[PDB]
Amino acid sequence: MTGKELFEMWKIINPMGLLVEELKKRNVSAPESRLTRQSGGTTALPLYFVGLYCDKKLIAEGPGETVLVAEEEAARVALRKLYGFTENRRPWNY
Amino acid sequence: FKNKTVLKKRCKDCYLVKRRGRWYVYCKTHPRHKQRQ
Amino acid sequence: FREVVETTIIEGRITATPKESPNPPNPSGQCPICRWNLKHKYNYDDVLLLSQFIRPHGGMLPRKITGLCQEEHRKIEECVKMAHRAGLLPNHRPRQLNRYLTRWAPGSVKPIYKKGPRWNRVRMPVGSPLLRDNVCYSRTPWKLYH
Amino acid sequence: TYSPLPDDYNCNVELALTSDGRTIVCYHPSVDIPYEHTKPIPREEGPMIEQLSKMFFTTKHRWYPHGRYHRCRKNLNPPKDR
Amino acid sequence: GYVPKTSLSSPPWPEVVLPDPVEETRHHAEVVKKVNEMIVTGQYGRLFAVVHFASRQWKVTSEDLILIGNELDLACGERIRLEKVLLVGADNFTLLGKPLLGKDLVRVEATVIEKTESWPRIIMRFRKRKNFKKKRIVTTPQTVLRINSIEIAPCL
Amino acid sequence: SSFSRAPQQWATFARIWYLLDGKMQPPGKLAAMASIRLQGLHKPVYHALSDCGDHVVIMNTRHIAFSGNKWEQKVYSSHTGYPGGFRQVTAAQLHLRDPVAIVKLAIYGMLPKNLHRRTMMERLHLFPDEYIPEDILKNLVEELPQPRKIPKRLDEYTQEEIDAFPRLWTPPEDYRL
RNA sequence: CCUACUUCACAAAGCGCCUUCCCCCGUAAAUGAUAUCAUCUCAACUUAGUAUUAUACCCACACACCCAAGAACAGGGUU
Ligand SMILES: [Zn+2]
Ligand SMILES: [Zn+2]
Numbered sequence: 001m002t003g004k005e006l007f008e009m010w011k012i013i014n015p016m017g018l019l020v021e022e023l024k025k026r027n028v029s030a031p032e033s034r035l036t037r038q039s040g041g042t043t044a045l046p047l048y049f050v051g052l053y054c055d056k057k058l059i060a061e062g063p064g065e066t067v068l069v070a071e072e073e074a075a076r077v078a079l080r081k082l083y084g085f086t087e088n089r090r091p092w093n094y
Numbered sequence: 095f096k097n098k099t100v101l102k103k104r105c106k107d108c109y110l111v112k113r114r115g116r117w118y119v120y121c122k123t124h125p126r127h128k129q130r131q
Numbered sequence: 132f133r134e135v136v137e138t139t140i141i142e143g144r145i146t147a148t149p150k151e152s153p154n155p156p157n158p159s160g161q162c163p164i165c166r167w168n169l170k171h172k173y174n175y176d177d178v179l180l181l182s183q184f185i186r187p188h189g190g191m192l193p194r195k196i197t198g199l200c201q202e203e204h205r206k207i208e209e210c211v212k213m214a215h216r217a218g219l220l221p222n223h224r225p226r227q228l229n230r231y232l233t234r235w236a237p238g239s240v241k242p243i244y245k246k247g248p249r250w251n252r253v254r255m256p257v258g259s260p261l262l263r264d265n266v267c268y269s270r271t272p273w274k275l276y277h
Numbered sequence: 278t279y280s281p282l283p284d285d286y287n288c289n290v291e292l293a294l295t296s297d298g299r300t301i302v303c304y305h306p307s308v309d310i311p312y313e314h315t316k317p318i319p320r321e322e323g324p325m326i327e328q329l330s331k332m333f334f335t336t337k338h339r340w341y342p343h344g345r346y347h348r349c350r351k352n353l354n355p356p357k358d359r
Numbered sequence: 360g361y362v363p364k365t366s367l368s369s370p371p372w373p374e375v376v377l378p379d380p381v382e383e384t385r386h387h388a389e390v391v392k393k394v395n396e397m398i399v400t401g402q403y404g405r406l407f408a409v410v411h412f413a414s415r416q417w418k419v420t421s422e423d424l425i426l427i428g429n430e431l432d433l434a435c436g437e438r439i440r441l442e443k444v445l446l447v448g449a450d451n452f453t454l455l456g457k458p459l460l461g462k463d464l465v466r467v468e469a470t471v472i473e474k475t476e477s478w479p480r481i482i483m484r485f486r487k488r489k490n491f492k493k494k495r496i497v498t499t500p501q502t503v504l505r506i507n508s509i510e511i512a513p514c515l
Numbered sequence: 516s517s518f519s520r521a522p523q524q525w526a527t528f529a530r531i532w533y534l535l536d537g538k539m540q541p542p543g544k545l546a547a548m549a550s551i552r553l554q555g556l557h558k559p560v561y562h563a564l565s566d567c568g569d570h571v572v573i574m575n576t577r578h579i580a581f582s583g584n585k586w587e588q589k590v591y592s593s594h595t596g597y598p599g600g601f602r603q604v605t606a607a608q609l610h611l612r613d614p615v616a617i618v619k620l621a622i623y624g625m626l627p628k629n630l631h632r633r634t635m636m637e638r639l640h641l642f643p644d645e646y647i648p649e650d651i652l653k654n655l656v657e658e659l660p661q662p663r664k665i666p667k668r669l670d671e672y673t674q675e676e677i678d679a680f681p682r683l684w685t686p687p688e689d690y691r692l
Numbered sequence: 693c694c695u696a697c698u699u700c701a702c703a704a705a706g707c708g709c710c711u712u713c714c715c716c717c718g719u720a721a722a723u724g725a726u727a728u729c730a731u732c733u734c735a736a737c738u739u740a741g742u743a744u745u746a747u748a749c750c751c752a753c754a755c756a757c758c759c760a761a762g763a764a765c766a767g768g769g770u771u
Contacts, residue, residue: 002422003359005519034315039531040570042650044332047529056312062518063526067318073522080517087517088404088450091421094507095719114719115239115734132692148688152681156361163683168362176666177365179680186692189736190725198684208726208735215736219668225723225737228607229539229580231666239734240584242605256734257583268370277583279378293387293394295515300464301455302394302515334570334637363681366666584734604743612744691728 002092006085007076016075019052022082028054031078033071036061050074095130102129162200170203171266175213175232175258178220189215189223202261209234209259232258284308394452395515402451406509409446410467411459416445419467423506430500433471438507441467447511454511463514473503527560530638531569532651534658537618538575541582544662545573546621552659553626553635563631570638572651577614577643580663581606591620614643 001009012018020030031052039047050070051061060078064070080086095118101110107123121127133145151163160166164173173180184192184199184207191211194204214220217231230237234256246253254276267273282290288305295302326340362368378386397403407420413427419441433439444465447454454460477499484493518526533552537545548571551557555567581589589606609616618641626632640651647655686692 007519033318034312035318036310036315039529039656040654042653043334045530047526047531049526050318051310051315053312053315058309058312060517061310063522063529065525069522071318073519076519077517086404090401090404091508109731111731112734113239113732115235115241120731132686133689135691145688148686149682151683151685167681167683168360169365169368169683172362172367173365174367177367178667178669179672179677180363180365180683182669183683186725186728188724190728191735192692192725193727196687196690196728204726211726212735217666219666220736221668221670223669223736228586228610229578230582230584230586231580232582233584233734235584235734236736237584237587237734240587242590242603243588244590244603246590255583255585255588266367268367268372277585279376291390293390295391296388299457300460300515301457302391303453303455304390304394304451305453306451330637336634336637339634363683364679608744610744 005087006080006083012079015072015079019075019078019082022079023054026082031059033074035067052078095128098129098131101131103127162198162203164199164203171264173210174262174265175210175217176219177210178214181207181211181214182220182223185211185220185223187223188225189220206261209261212236213259234259391515394454395513397452398511398515399513403449403511405449406511407448408444408465408467408509410441411443411445412441419506419509421506421508424472425469425504425506427502427504428477428499429502430474431471431502433502435471435474437471439469439471439504441469441506447509454515461514463512466508466510466512468507468510469504470507471502472505475501475503477501528565528567530567532654532656533569533571534655535571535573536575536658536661537573538578538661539580539665540661540663542576542579542618542621545579545618546625548659548662549573549618549622549639550625553622553638563627566631566634568631568635568638570640570654572640572642572647572655573618574642574645574647576618576641577610579610579618586610591616615641 007015016033023030031054034051034053035048036051036058037047037049041048046065048064048067048070049061050064050067050073051058052071052074053059060074060081062070062072062074062077064073101117101119103110103119104127105121105124108119108121108127111118111120117131119127119129132148133143135141135143155166156168157166164170169180175181184197186192189211191204191208194201197204197207199207211220213232213234215223216233216237218229228237243253243255256275257277258273258275260275263273263275265273281292284290285308288307291304293302293304294300326337329335329340330337377383405420407418409416410419411417412425413429417425419425442462444460444467445456445458447460447465454464479496479498482495482497485491535545535548552569552571555561555565555569557569558567561567586607587605590603591606591609592601592603594601604612606617619636619639622639623632623636626635
């Protein structure tokens with residue numbers, strides 16, 4: 001699993017729904033998806049950054065080609081942060 | 095006008111004026127003195 | 132400043148005239164520029180400085196009246212020409228390409244059809260050589276030719 | 278109040294020297310995007326090459342095909358890193 | 360020496376007033392203490408490090424691979440400590456040596472994962488119309504190292 | 516960090532839209548900025564083969580300003596290819612004919628002289644006046660600072676600034692002026 | 693371009709006929725400072741002074757035979 005990604009190893013569907021479930025378990029209101037940054041919205045190569053905000057607090061933001069894809073990726077990033085499987089997490093100890 | 099590298103006033107009424115980028119000697123009394131740099 | 136008024140009968144009346152600001156930084160200086168420590172510290176765009184030596188219609192004022200040095204009067208005259216050509220004195224006029232630092236009158240310069248070889252290039256003057264000694268805060272000196 | 282660089286973007290940088298002065302510590306926590314700085318989520322060959330060039334802001338040249346020579350020189354199993 | 364405000368009267372750059380040395384030293388002590396407490400509590404994830412090994416500087420992290428272009432006189436699988444660590448950095452803080460960090464601060468450990476020879480490199484000389492043509496093949500020895508761990512200690 | 520591979524790559528290599536205002540700005544400095552952005556030399560991930568250029572939208576190109584007498588001295592030379600087809604036109608004439616040619620040519624000359632130059636120019640959008648197409652406006656991301664700070668006119672200077680600036684000399688009272 | 697004339701003859705030609713439309717700047721002046729006159733101004737500026745050639749032309753588009761279209765291909769017509 002070194003170099004692998006959390007959802008590369010554990011395939012999931014509806015990461016936004018799964019994140020909503022996790023926040024409900026943690027007794028937290030559903031996150032608000034918001035457009036933090038965007039570029040070339042009307043072009044064929046857009047860049048959208050979508051951040052999920054918990055009571056006006058950013059929990060995770062993700063990039064994408066469309067707003068839906070960016071929101072989905074932001075949900076995945078939020079899930080990674082919640083589960084502690086972030087890319088910059090502590091290495092495994094050998 | 096006569097083209098001259100060195101402009102010289104020939105009479106009293108000859109006057110030097112820099113116009114359209116270059117010097118000219120104009121003269122009302124003797125228009126013969128007209129010189130252009 | 133005296134102004135001539137007609138009604139024909141014509142007479143001259145002296146009106147309010149500005150006075151030099153109190154406490155010059157460098158009293159006992161040759162010209163006003165030196166008195167106020169501006170020897171090499173003004174440019175074509177310093178309209179506040181330049182307009183103080185300008186007739187209401189844009190003409191320069193005589194050196195005898197202004198008290199400026201010969202070199203400082205020349206510098207001010209050139210800077211005023213540049214400011215007029217750049218349009219920084221819209222109110223000082225006799226009665227559409229944006230420019231600045233134009234040394235020559237626009238109507239007296241011919242196009243550079245044949246710029247010479249690299250070693251003998253014909254360069255386009257920029258600014259005025261009279262301001263060559265202005266205070267330079269940049270590593271490289273001002274390029275008077277482009 | 279002096280700041281080495283604007284603190285608005287990419288992190289809040291704080292430089293320091295250790296007491297011995299032989300190492301430099303930098304504390305740079307990332308700065309989150311304020312909620313107020315965000316917007317709500319909204320809810321023939323010739324003509325074809327012209328359309329593609331307009332779409333992707335490229336030139337026509339890259340949309341024309343290439344010969345078998347190049348198509349077969351191209352490596353179909355390139356090495357992959359990371 | 361007053362000068363009226365003209366374009367060239369003042370320098371074109373903003374005036375910067377550096378913090379007074381005493382207050383700045385107190386602030387440095389505060390920041391260093393904060394970072395040291397982060398290290399003590401283990402508030403970091405991946406650590407990277409710029410380490411000067413062989414003759415070059417490598418940006419390194421745990422599990423990384425490094426290809427030294429020479430034999431190291433070490434048995435394969437042997438563990439080593441890389442000692443010239445110029446920089447150690449985390450998500451929220453970085454430590455810079457002047458020019459090297461102390462041994463007590465950082466401990467970068469590697470392992471000789473492989474010893475090999477480089478692919479044949481061709482050295483050809485040629486000069487036209489001189490009958491001058493020479494060819495040589497060189498295989499430089501190489502050692503692959505795997506960086507196992509990067510450790511930091513609260514020694515600031 | 517923590518992005519998936521494809522979103523991370525897309526974000527890293529996405530092309531941003533920049534806006535330059537050419538009003539009273541030197542076309543050369545505008546072109547330097549635009550050429551850097553078009554090549555992508557403003558990105559740390561830059562590489563000639565990565566196609567990392569960005570979009571640059573320059574407005575008010577009709578209102579650029581040349582230093583010196585360049586409007587009259589600078590000459591743009593072209594040849595139709597036919598005998599007697601050599602055309603030399605001054606900067607002022609070229610500007611009057613095409614209000615975009617000057618900036619377009621400056622950026623073209625500043626770009627690298629290879630096959631990517633015209634692809635880069637395809638990402639350059641020059642508009643003579645303040646009007647910009649709506650799609651381009653929505654695409655815009657950032658506005659670059661104008662390279663040259665426009666000097667103020669007397670008509671623009673505030674009375675407070677005029678008062679602050681000292682009077683330099685005592686004009687003789689008995690003078691016509 | 694072929695109505696005449698002519699070479700000639702279901703048409704090609706001239707010796708025949710028809711149509712041909714915009715400037716460029718060298719200087720001459722007005723007002724006016726530096727240099728309170730004066731001064732056409734690589735001073736600001738006002739005219740002769742204009743190019744930023746104005747336009748005109750073309751703009752549709754799926755066998756076989758004929759063609760004023762044509763080397764082939766292509767093009768026009770086939771009601
Ligand atoms: Zn005479
Ligand atoms: Zn003096």
